[PDB]
Amino acid sequence: LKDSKPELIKLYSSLGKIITSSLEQQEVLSAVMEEVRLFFSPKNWSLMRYDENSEELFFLIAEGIQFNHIRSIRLKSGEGIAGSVVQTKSPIFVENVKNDPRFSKKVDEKTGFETKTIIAVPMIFRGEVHGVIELVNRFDGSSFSPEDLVILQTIADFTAISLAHSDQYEKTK
């Protein structure tokens, strides 16, 4: 079936195994891509890292848009759905970004993509926010399940662990 419990627990217990398998940031980022693709195959999704010093978010991963167009983007805290996730430390689901004042058009203006829906989750490790993962125009009010949310939160949890350790390993070297 793959809906049977034995298959579900195999799948759920595989989470994190690719993501946590390297200390080097590039390999972590590739691994995150692999697990996100496996569970969601999103045409548009991203991972934004939070810089504690500048209090800004920047892109590390941005699938379905041109990385060159968004390399220079920095979001201030509270800016965008992604910025609000950092502040609230909680997920945000938005069925239509026009109807949300928190939304930031900045990136759509650079890319010419039109954002309609966002699920955004915080990456938290030991109480610190390391960033945000967004799935863009992937889900709407009907298709977004509690299981989807938990799977995505779990990916974000393991990614936080791996990125924290990658940073700490870089320092000592």
Ligand X SMILES: Nc1ncnc2c1ncn2[C@@H]1O[C@@H]2COP(=O)(O)O[C@H]2[C@H]1O
Q: Euclidean distance between the first and final Cα of the chain, in Å?
A: 47
Please, which residues have CB within 8 angstroms of residue 125's CB and are 6 or more apart in sequence?
Answer: 157, 160, 161, 163, 164
Q: Which stretch binds ligand X (CB under 6 A): 16-24, 26-34, 74-82, 148-156?
A: 74-82
**Residue 136 CB, nearest distance to ligand X (Å)?**
4
Helix (H, G, I), strand (E, B) or coil at 46: strand
Residue 145 binds which of ligand X, a copy of itself, none (CB < 5-8 A, kind-dependent): a copy of itself
In what helix (H) or strand (E) does residue 61 lie, and over which residues does it extend?
strand 56-63
**Residue 120 CB, nearest distance to a copy of itself (Å)?**
16
- At residue 65, φ and ψ (nearest 5 deg) are -135, 165
Interface residue list for a copy of itself (CB under 8 A): 1-2, 5-6, 8-13, 15-17, 20-21, 23, 125-126, 144-147, 149-151, 153-154, 157-158, 161-162, 165, 168-169, 172-173
